[PDB]
Amino acid sequence: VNSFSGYLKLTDNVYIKNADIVEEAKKVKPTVVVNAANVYLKHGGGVAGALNKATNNAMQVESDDYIATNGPLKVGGSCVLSGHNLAKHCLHVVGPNVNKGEDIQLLKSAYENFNQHEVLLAPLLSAGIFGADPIHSLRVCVDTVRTNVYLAVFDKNLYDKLVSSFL
Ligand SMILES: CCc1c[nH]c2ncnc(NCC(C)(C)CC(F)(F)F)c12
Ligand SMILES: [Cl-]
């Protein structure tokens, strides 16, 4: 039993809700919140900009030190950093950004990072400003993630379409 509330169950392990991931993280304080990161951990907009803003830019400060030490992530890769005031940990995961021309096949690799964590609060990878089809991203999530994932979909219209079109 966990503290996530109001989710619709899609499969044995995948759950979904119309929610602002920022507000959801603040309420649940999950062990892991997933960020829709880029390789430079520059948290400018989309989910990343919103999460960082909620940390009062502490996520960005920590991220800049991470990059200065380690260099950029790989597309499809991830790193674990602090969750600040939102969660114990933040798993920064880089899905491909279609608006940069990146290979959509890397979306599966991106979701594989979730399997290293038993329970996660997450957005749909590569959706929103990353330019992928959110319906496809959900299909890849369900077919790749085996651990327990609670998906937050900000857009109510999109949430309804995701549920109504789910196979
Ligand atoms: C600023 C963005 C954002 C803040 N809080 C969030 N929580 C969840 N998902 C988010 N964005 C991903 C979507 C849901 C695919 C974006 C889209 F497609 F609907 F426009 C956000
Ligand atoms: Cl977005």
Swiss-Prot record:
Responsible for the cleavages located at the N-terminus of the replicase polyprotein. Participates together with nsp4 in the assembly of virally-induced cytoplasmic double-membrane vesicles necessary for viral replication. Antagonizes innate immune induction of type I interferon by blocking the phosphorylation, dimerization and subsequent nuclear translocation of host IRF3. Also prevents host NF-kappa-B signaling. In addition, PL-PRO possesses a deubiquitinating/deISGylating activity and processes both 'Lys-48'- and 'Lys-63'-linked polyubiquitin chains from cellular substrates. It comes from the Viruses. This is Papain-like protease nsp3. It is found in: Host endoplasmic reticulum membrane. May form homohexamers. Interacts with N protein. Changing T31A: In strain: Mu/B.1.621. It catalyses: Thiol-dependent hydrolysis of ester, thioester, amide, peptide and isopeptide bonds formed by the C-terminal Gly of ubiquitin (a 76-residue protein attached to proteins as an intracellular targeting signal). Residues 1-167 form the Macro domain. Inhibited in vitro by GRL-0617. It is a multi-pass membrane protein.
